Amino acid sequence: REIITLQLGQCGNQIGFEFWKQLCAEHGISPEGIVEEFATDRKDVFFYQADDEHYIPRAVLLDLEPRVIHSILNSPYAKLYNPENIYLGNNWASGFSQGEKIHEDIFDIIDREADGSDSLEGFVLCHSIAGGTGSGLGSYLLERLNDRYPKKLVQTYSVFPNQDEDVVVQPYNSLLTLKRLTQNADCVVVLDNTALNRIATDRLHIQNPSFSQINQLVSTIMSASTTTLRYPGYMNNDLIGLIASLIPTPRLHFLMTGYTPLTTDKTTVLDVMRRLLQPKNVMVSTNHCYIAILNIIQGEVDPTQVHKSLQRIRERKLANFIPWGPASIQVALSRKSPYLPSAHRVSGLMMANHTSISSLFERTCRQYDKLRKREAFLEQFRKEDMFKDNFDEMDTSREIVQQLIDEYHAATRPDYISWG
């Protein structure tokens, strides 16, 4: 069924227009949505079909105190993304409250898209954590969608912010968002600003315009993550079918990324797998172990060597994990698209459930705990205090995220058969 992408907040909308533009070039689409003349792909899922071959994506763009959405509008692709579905603080509470007054009409916008699609499987949020406006509103919307669509699923391409630690209330914001995300999100793919910045310094000399260039990197992750859906085959022809293997227990639903040719601008599958498992190609910053790993390679891959390649990696032992889960590593292939450069003829991506991300969660929890004891930045803005006089949703979030940390380390333990 078709997927609706609920891109919200300034940062989320930034990664959103880049994701859609990436799929515009990748598919046979021009900046006006008309089928390209020069143009085998399952464009049903991601692009709604208009009668005159205007392939308009099912993008829901949510703006709050709009500054960059006007820049999105005055772009060549504005005609391309036209469901006509854009409806008008730096604090999570302010974002939640501002969402709470606009919930109904943005949900009618959700309804219209869901209705126009013959069916609907997934809501894919380009969420920004501690994004001022993006956070809070995204958490409220996340709490709303699950109730209205109990059967359906939410994925979140969450860009977890680590900038070497300006917004001072980041730990508080992220703490609350993670509570809502831990209990009310079926899947999350975690990305890290510091990790992508370090990769940026590696592959290029860009340091100061970090945000503009890293948009490309996250766009590549996002497009490649869906390529198996966007193009037919024998397996992972549906999102849930893909998610199931990646996501073994509900709580530990945060997925690590990696891309083999980070400098994608012939290599055999053995080379691509090994190279990827190395920590440099990973895009995220007591024993620790993966829970389960998946790989998708798109290019001129010989078939008989792929399963032998799994054999060879099994001899190498690069990815060390002894989790409760008996899930092995999942070697998969997808179709590299035409019309774009095919440089680095073979190129792959990995999604894996790794306990290391618990460390990143605990870093922001550590910052929050220190800030909470100092009590320096409660904000205490009348919005903050009236919306939370008790300020006990923060403590509820702290215990919930602490449960998540403990659950991760319990998964590391041999006895996650018992309660985690």
Binding site: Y234, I240, G241, G325, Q330
Partner: protein, 330 residues
């Protein structure tokens, strides 16, 4: 050859027969399953073919299959099986792709019967992945409203671990059946057919492609024992379907009555705590024997994947037991 290639298009029929009857398109089988869940889960002794035909038409319109020649798109048709007693539609439902005339020369009765054996295997091994994916569908979509009742959360996690242990068995046997039974055989077939000049070498090579699928899969009379043990796993998946169904069914049933009880407020629920505290042990033991039985069957099957043919089966045992969770005495 030159006239069958153009007039009655043996090439395009053999080209799309993988895409539809060997699940090559995949998107098509997904969308067909998605819309055809209710009728099949309903006992198909009441069901009849015309409904399946009508839904299949719009399924073909929904997928990219429509972007094909209408002759092949019309030859395909749903087939009822023998109406097995006390059964559900999922066990008796198979595509046929009736063929008569020139192309039937290549695609004989023996070919159709062996394609039906192949489809019998792939429909199980495809249904059960989507079954387990519906298990994970219900798991994530019931857990997200049931974590204000931590009584259930602890038992809930035990169901989660078994379901996501079952995911890997299939999703590994899938990338086996995909790129080691239905792409290498197809590439072999395709080259040997496109290069041919005598038509007898089309026929006697397409039959080799058939009889190599039947051996790279477990359908051969000698891998039948390995398939017979695989039947146990393919059974235990739908056993978990019924179990998972019950544990959520009555648990959530009580939760709904609790909401109506607080609405009456807007002692009976202490009796419901009573039945809860006596129900937790029995369900826990049931799930425990389920997990142990699954371990006992999968370990014996995984060791049964010794070097026997070793083109793909010892390799597949490696696939299954990567990280050496099994063979370390579990």
């Amino acid at each position: 050859l030159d006239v069958l290639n153009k007039k009655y298009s043996l090439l395009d029929h053999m080209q799309a027969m993988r895409r539809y009857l060997l699940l090559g398109q995949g998107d098509f089988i997904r969308h067909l399953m998605d819309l055809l869940k209710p009728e099949l889960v309903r006992p198909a002794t009441t069901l009849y073919q015309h409904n399946l035909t009508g839904i299949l038409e719009t399924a073909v319109r929904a997928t990219n299959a429509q972007f094909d020649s209408p002759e092949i798109l019309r030859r395909l048709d749903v087939r009822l099986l023998e109406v097995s007693p006390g059964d559900t539609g999922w066990d008796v439902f198979s595509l046929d792709y009736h063929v008569d005339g020139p192309i039937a020369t290549v695609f004989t009765r023996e070919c159709m019967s062996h394609y039906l054996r192949v489809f019998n295997f792939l429909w199980r091994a495809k249904r059960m992945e989507y079954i387990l994916t519906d298990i994970r569908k219900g798991h994530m979509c019931n857990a997200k409203l049931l974590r204000n009742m931590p009584e259930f959360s602890g038992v809930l996690h035990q169901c989660h671990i078994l379901a996501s242990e079952m995911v890997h068995f299939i999703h590994q046997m899938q990338y086996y059946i995909t790129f080691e039974v239905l792409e290498c055989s197809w590439d072999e077939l395709w080259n040997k057919v496109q290069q041919a000049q005598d038509l007898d070498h089309i026929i006697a090579a397409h039959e080799v492609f058939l009889d190599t699928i039947i051996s790279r899969c477990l359908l051969d009379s000698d891998s039948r024992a390995l398939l017979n043990q695989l039947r146990a796993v393919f059974d235990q998946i739908i056993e978990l379907q019924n179990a998972q169904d019950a544990i959520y069914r009555a648990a959530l049933e009580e939760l709904q009555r609790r909401l109506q009880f607080e609405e009456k407020k807007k002692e009976e629920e202490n009796k419901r705590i009573g039945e809860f505290k006596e129900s937790i042990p029995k369900m826990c033991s049931q799930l425990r024997i389920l997990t142990h039985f699954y371990q006992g069957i999968v370990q014996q099957f995984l060791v049964l994947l010794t070097t026997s043919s070793d083109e793909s089966l010892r390799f597949l045992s490696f696939r299954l037991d990567f990280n050496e969770h099994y063979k370390a005495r579990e």
